[PDB]
Write a protein that binds this ligand. Structure first.
Ligand code: SPH
Ligand code: SPH
Ligand code: SPH
Lengths: 235, 234, 227, 227, 227, 60, 60
C-alpha cells in the first residue's frame, strides 16, 4: 500500500528507493494495451508516462528539478488453457533508435508519448519523406530498439510473466542517474519494455486477445525549484 | 649528474604499460562520486547473468524473435533429439552472442562450470518429462536418448516446475579452453530428448515453446584479454 | 583461479586509438592546423567496450604517436619538426589561423612535441560536471515550450560530454618542401568505476547515438539439431 | 669448483634469434604488413637447446632489433619511421590490410617503436594452458571415429603450443621512396624449470616435428685402435 | 567544493609565450644575432592576467622552444645547429657582431642549446630592486626642474622594470645554405604573491603603458527587457 | 651507470608541468618582502566584490 | 628533473644482460605448476648419466 492506493517482486540492483510530493506519489493506472498473437511489444518512459497523473504531473511541471523511484506492477491474467510469456524489462537511459538517415533526429513530442507509450516493430523501416519527416522512433524488437540483441536484455532488471505460472510482475526501480537530481521534463530516467518472449496462443482460436495493465507508483519523490508552470509543446 | 645507463626498451610505447605521466590540469577540484545503483567490479559478474540463447538459428528464424523459441508438440514419444548444442561458449554461433559469449570473445582462455536453464512456456494443462544431457568430449555426438542417457543428465518434469537448470561442471584435460573452435580443447555436447511425450487435454494448444538461458557459475574465470571479432569498422 | 584479469580496471587497461589528426607543414589546399573535438565515438572498439555500462568514472591517459613524411621524392630535405597540441576547453577562443594569437596559450594547457621523441603522454583526472560520465542520455538539452516556433535540440545530445578540443599545428616555419604529419591519439581509462551493465552493441554503429542503419542481420544460420 | 654456469637458468640465459620479420614502407609486389606466428622452431640453436627436455615452464623476454634501408640510390630522403608490433592472441581478428580497423588495438597489446631507438623489449609470464609447455606431444588433436569419412588431424599437432601471432607494420604514411625493414626477434626464457631430459638432436631438423630426411650419417670415421 | 584552482599560484601556473626571437645562420640582409629586451608586454594574454593586480613578487621560469628551417629547396644539407642565449643584465656590454668578444660570457649567464633537444629551461628568483614588481607606476624617472631647458622623461617609465636582455646567436660557423630559426620564450611565474587588485583591461593594449587608441566600444547591444 | 628506461612522454614540454630547473643566477640575495596592503590569495576574492552591471546596453 | 649523466654502454643490447622490462600481459593468472617426475636443475646432471660410446667408427 502506497497512499490511498493498494495493490515475484524484484528490487532493481538490490537497492530500494531512497531520498537524497507525498500525496501526489501513489499508484496510477495507465491505459490498458491488448496482447494479440501478432503483437511485437510495448514501451514507456518514466517519468514521461506519468506526466498527466493528478498532482504528480503538476509537481513535475511546476519544479525545475525532480527525482523519484518507481514501483511498476504489470497485470495480465488468462486461463489455464492459455499459453504465452512476457518479458518486462526496466532499462536505465533507454535510448531508442530513430527512423531517418539523420542521427538523433527524433523530435521531443515523439520521444515523450505519455501513458500510451509506443510499440516495437518486427523489422526496420526507413522514413523517406524528406519534406515532412516523421522524426519518430523505429525500435526493432529483436534489436531491443537500440542495436543490441534482445536475448541479452535480461542483464537489465526484469521479470517474466509466464501465463502457466503467474499473472503479474512487480519491479521496484530506485532513482538511477549520473546526478543526484535532474530535470524531469528534459530527461527520462527509466524505460519499460514489454516483449512477448513466447507468443500468445489459445486452443483452436486465431482470435484470442488479452489485456495488459500497468500500474506505476512514484516513490521517494523530491521536487525543488518552484517557478511558473512548464507547458511543453505538443504535436 | 647521476651516472645512468639506458637499457633496451627505452623510448618505446607499449599500450599495456603502467607508467606515471604529468597532469595536464593541475589542482582540478574533482566532483565526488555518488552511490549509484548497479556498480560492477568484474566482467565475470556480467557473465554470471542468465541471457536467452538464440537456439533456433534457421534460415527463416535467425535475426528475429523466433530464433529464441524451440517448439515442442504433443506427438508420440520418439528418441530423436529436440536440440543439440556444442559446449563451445565463445565459438558456437548459438552461444557466441549471449552475454557470456560476448564477454568470452574479449578473452583467449576460459575455465569453469556453466549453467543452462530451460523455461517451458505452454499451458498449465500440459504435462511431460524431458531429458537434458551433457556428454563430455571424445566420443561421437549422441544421436538418440540411449546414448545421451550414458552421460551426465537431469530429468525435467514440466508439470512439476516450468524452469529447470542443468549445471555442466568443468571437465577438461587442459586447465583452460580456448575461446575459438579447437579440437584439442573441445567441450562436449548438450542434448535434449523426450523422456515421456508431452500430453495435453482437449481444447488446449498442442504446440508450445521452450526458451534457453545460459550463464557462468561462480568458479568461472578468463585470461589473456584480446580484441573481439564481433565489432568492425569500415 | 582468480579473476584478476577480468576486473573492470584490467578490462580497460589498454591504450586505444580514438583519433588520427592530420596536419601539414607547407607554405600558405593544405591544412596548417587541425581541430579535433575530444571523443571516443570516432572509433568502435573502445566505444563498444565502454558501452557495456551506463555510467562511468575514471581518469584518462592520452598518448600521442606522431608520424610524418615527405610528399615528393628528392624535393629536398627538412629540419626536425616541432608540433604544438593545445587543449581548448569549451569556451576558450578557437584558433582560426596557423599564426593567430591564441597559440600563445597563456592559460590553455599545451604540449610541444619534438619529432623522433617517444610518443607524448599526459594524464587528466575525472573532469565530468556530473558525478559520473553518461554513455547514454535519454533526454534533450532543451524542452520545447508551447508558444515556441517549429527548443529543437537533438535527441540525446547534452553538454555533459563536452570536453573541448585539441588544436594541432607544426610550430616550425614552413619548409620549402611539403610535409604531412599524422598524430594518433590513444586513450587509457584509469581507476575505473562503472555502473548499470548493458547488452553489447550487436550491429554497426551509426552516428554518436544508438541509431542503426545497416548490418541488422548479424547472426548466422545454424541447424537446431546440429552440434 | 661450483656448477653455477651449468644451472638450467644459466644455460638458457641468452637472447636467441627466432625470427626475421620483413616489412616494407611503400605506396600501395610489396608487403605493407607481416604476420609471424610465434614459435621457436623457425631456428635451430634455441630449439635444440630446449629439446634437451620434454617439459618446461618459464617466462619469456622478447627483444626486437629493427634495421631498415633505402632500396634505390639517390632516390630521395625519408623521415624517421615508426613501427607497430601488435600481439594477436588466438581468436582475435587478424589484420587484412595496412589500414584496417584492427590496428586500433583497443584490447590487443601493442608496441610502437621509433627507428634509431634501442631495441624494443617486453616480458610475458608462463602462458601455457597446461601446467607446462610440451616440447613433444605423442598424440593427435582429434581421434578419428568409426563412421567418419576418410578426424584427420596431423600427428603431434595440438593447440597447447598456439600462442597467437605478431602483426608488424610501418605506422608512417608511405614515403615517395621505397624503404625495407627487418625486425629480428630474440627470445630469452627466464625462471626456467625443465623435466624429462632427452638425447639431443643428432640430424638436421625437418619440420616442426621430429621427422628427419637428410644428413642421417653424422658421425665421422675413426679407427678403433687409433687415439 | 574547494578553491584550489583559483589560488593565485594556480591562476599563473602556465607557461605563456612572451617573445619570438628570430635568428639566421648564413654567411655575412640577414641577422646573425638578435637582442630581445626582457618583458611580458610584447604579448597580451599574460599581460592582462598580471595586470589584474598592482604589485607582485614571484620567481620566473623561462622555457625556450627552438624551431628552424631551410630557406631554399634542395639547396643542400646542414649539420645540427647549436644556439647560444646569453643574458645581458643592464650595464653589461652588448654584442655588436656575431663574433665579438662579448660572447665569451665569462660573467654573463649563458645557455647552449642543441637543436632537436627538449626545449631549454632555466629559473630565476625574484630579482626586483624594489620589494615588489610594479605593474603600474604613476610617476616619472626625472622631475624637470626650473632652469632646465625644454628632465623630460616619459610618463610611467622607470628603471624598476629594467631586467636586461637576451642575445641569441647560432654558434655554428655558417653553412653554405641559409637557415632560419625562431626561439619562442615561455614565462611561468612561481611562488606568486600579488597586491591591490585592479579591473581587467577592457580595450586593446596600445604601448607599454595604459594608453588606448582603438576598439573603445567593447560591449555589444542587448535590450534591457530581453533575457 | 644505473639502469634506466625512458618512458613515453620523455623530452616533451607540457606548459602545465611542475618540474625543477637549474638557477641561472645562483647565490642571488633576494630583496625581502614588505607588508603591502591589499594582498590577494584567491581570484574568487575578486569575484566576491560587487561591481556595477551594465544593464542598459541599448544602441545609444 | 633529477640530474643524470648517460654513461657509455647506454642504448646497447647485450644478449647476455639481465634487466627488467614491462609486462605485455598484466594481471595474467598463471597456471600453477604440478609435481612432474624427472625435474633437472643442472646440465651436469645429464652429463652424469652413462651413455653408450660409439667406439667402432669404421667405414662399414
Ligand atoms: C596539453 C595537451 C593536451 C592535454 C589535455 C587533454 C584534454 C583534457 C581531457 C578532456 C577529455 C576528458 C576525458 C573524456 C572522457 C570521455 O569522453 C567520457 N567517457 C564521455 O562520456
Ligand atoms: C605488444 C608487443 C608484443 C608483445 C607480446 C608478445 C607475445 C606474447 C607471448 C606469446 C608467446 C608465449 C611464449 C612461447 C613459449 C614457447 O613457444 C613454448 N616453449 C612452446 O612449447
Ligand atoms: C642564461 C640564459 C638566460 C637565462 C637568464 C634569463 C634572464 C633573467 C631574468 C630577467 C627577467 C626577470 C623577470 C621579469 C619579471 C617581470 O618582467 C616583472 N613582473 C616586471 O614588472
Amino acid at each position: 500500500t502506497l497512499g490511498n492506493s493498494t495493490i515475484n517482486s524484484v528490487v532493481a540492483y538490490g537497492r530500494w528507493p531512497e531520498y537524497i510530493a507525498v500525496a501526489a506519489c501513489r499508484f496510477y493506472t495507465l491505459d490498458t494495451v491488448t496482447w494479440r498473437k501478432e503483437s511485437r511489444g510495448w514501451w514507456w518512459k518514466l517519468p514521461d508516462a506519468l506526466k498527466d497523473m493528478g498532482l504528480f504531473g503538476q509537481n513535475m511541471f511546476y519544479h525545475y528539478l525532480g527525482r523519484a523511484g518507481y514501483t511498476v506492477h504489470v497485470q495480465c491474467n488468462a486461463s489455464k488453457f492459455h499459453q504465452g510469456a512476457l518479458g518486462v524489462f526496466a532499462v536505465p537511459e533507454m535510448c531508442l533508435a530513430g527512423d531517418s538517415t539523420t542521427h538523433m533526429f527524433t523530435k521531443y513530442e515523439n520521444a515523450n508519448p505519455g501513458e500510451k507509450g509506443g510499440e516495437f516493430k518486427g523489422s526496420f523501416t526507413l522514413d523517406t519523406n524528406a519534406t515532412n519527416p516523421a522524426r519518430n522512433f523505429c525500435p526493432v524488437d529483436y534489436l531491443f530498439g537500440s542495436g543490441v540483441l534482445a536475448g541479452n536484455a535480461f542483464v537489465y532488471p526484469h521479470q517474466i510473466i509466464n501465463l502457466r505460472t503467474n499473472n503479474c510482475a512487480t519491479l521496484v526501480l530506485p532513482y538511477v542517474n549520473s546526478l543526484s537530481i535532474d530535470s524531469m521534463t528534459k530527461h527520462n530516467n527509466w524505460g519499460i519494455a514489454i516483449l512477448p518472449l513466447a507468443p500468445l496462443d489459445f486452443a483452436t482460436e486465431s482470435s484470442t486477445e488479452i489485456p495488459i495493465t500497468l500500474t506505476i507508483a512514484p516513490m521517494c519523490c523530491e521536487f525543488n525549484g518552484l517557478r511558473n508552470i512548464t507547458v511543453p509543446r505538443t504535436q | 649528474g647521476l651516472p645512468v645507463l639506458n637499457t633496451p626498451g627505452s623510448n618505446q610505447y607499449l599500450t599495456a604499460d603502467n607508467y606515471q605521466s604529468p597532469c595536464a590540469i593541475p589542482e582540478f577540484d574533482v566532483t565526488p562520486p555518488i552511490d549509484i545503483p548497479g556498480e560492477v567490479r568484474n566482467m565475470m559478474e556480467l557473465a554470471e547473468i542468465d541471457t536467452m540463447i538464440p537456439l533456433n538459428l534457421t534460415n527463416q528464424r535467425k535475426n528475429t524473435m523466433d530464433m529464441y523459441r524451440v517448439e515442442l508438440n504433443d506427438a508420440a514419444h520418439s528418441d530423436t533429439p529436440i536440440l543439440c548444442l556444442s559446449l563451445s561458449p565463445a565459438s558456437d554461433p548459438r552461444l557466441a552472442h549471449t552475454m557470456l559469449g560476448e564477454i568470452l570473445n574479449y578473452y583467449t582462455h576460459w575455465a569453469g562450470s556453466l549453467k543452462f536453464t530451460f523455461l517451458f512456456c505452454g499451458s498449465m494443462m500440459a504435462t511431460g518429462k524431458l531429458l537434458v544431457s551433457y556428454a563430455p568430449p571424445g566420443a561421437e555426438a549422441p544421436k538418440s536418448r540411449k546414448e545421451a542417457m550414458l552421460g551426465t543428465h537431469v530429468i525435467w518434469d514440466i508439470g512439476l516446475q516450468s524452469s529447470c537448470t542443468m549445471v555442466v561442471p568443468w571437465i577438461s584435460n587442459t586447465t583452460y579452453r580456448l575461446t575459438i573452435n579447437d579440437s584439442f580443447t573441445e567441450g562436449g555436447y548438450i542434448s535434449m530428448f523426450y523422456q515421456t511425450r508431452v500430453v495435453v487435454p482437449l481444447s488446449t494448444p498442442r504446440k508450445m515453446d521452450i526458451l534457453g538461458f545460459v550463464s557462468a557459475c561462480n568458479d568461472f574465470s578468463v585470461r589473456l584479454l584480446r580484441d573481439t571479432t564481433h565489432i568492425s569498422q569500415e | 583461479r582468480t579473476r584478476s584479469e577480468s576486473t573492470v580496471e584490467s578490462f580497460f587497461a589498454r591504450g586505444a586509438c580514438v583519433a588520427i589528426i592530420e596536419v601539414d607543414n607547407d607554405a600558405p589546399a593544405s591544412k596548417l592546423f587541425s581541430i579535433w573535438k575530444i571523443t571516443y565515438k570516432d572509433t568502435v572498439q573502445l566505444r563498444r567496450k565502454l558501452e557495456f555500462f551506463t555510467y562511468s568514472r575514471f581518469d584518462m591517459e592520452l598518448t600521442f604517436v606522431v608520424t610524418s613524411n615527405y610528399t615528393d621524392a628528392n624535393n629536398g630535405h627538412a629540419l626536425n619538426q616541432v608540433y604544438q597540441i593545445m587543449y581548448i576547453p569549451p569556451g576558450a577562443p578557437i584558433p582560426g589561423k596557423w599564426n593567430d594569437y591564441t597559440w600563445q596559450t597563456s592559460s590553455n594547457p599545451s604540449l610541444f612535441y619534438t619529432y623522433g621523441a617517444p610518443p607524448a603522454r599526459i594524464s587528466v583526472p575525472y573532469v565530468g560536471i556530473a558525478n559520473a560520465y553518461s554513455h547514454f542520455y535519454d533526454g534533450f538539452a532543451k524542452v520545447p515550450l508551447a508558444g515556441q516556433a517549429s527548443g529543437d535540440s537533438l535527441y540525446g545530445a547534452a553538454s555533459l560530454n563536452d570536453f573541448g578540443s585539441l588544436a594541432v599545428r607544426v610550430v616550425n616555419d614552413h619548409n620549402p618542401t611539403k610535409l604531412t604529419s599524422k598524430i594518433r591519439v590513444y586513450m587509457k581509462p584509469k581507476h575505473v568505476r562503472v555502473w548499470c551493465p548493458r547488452p553489447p552493441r550487436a550491429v554497426p554503429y551509426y552516428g554518436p547515438g544508438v541509431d542503426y542503419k545497416d548490418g541488422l542481420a548479424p547472426l548466422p544460420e545454424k541447424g537446431l539439431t546440429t552440434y
